[PDB]
Amino acid sequence: HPLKQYWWRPSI
DSSP: OOSGGGOSSTTO
16 A cells, blocks of 8 residues: 555645
């Protein structure tokens, strides 16, 4: 369960 759910928008 990586940080795939962390790509809220700032992960760019």
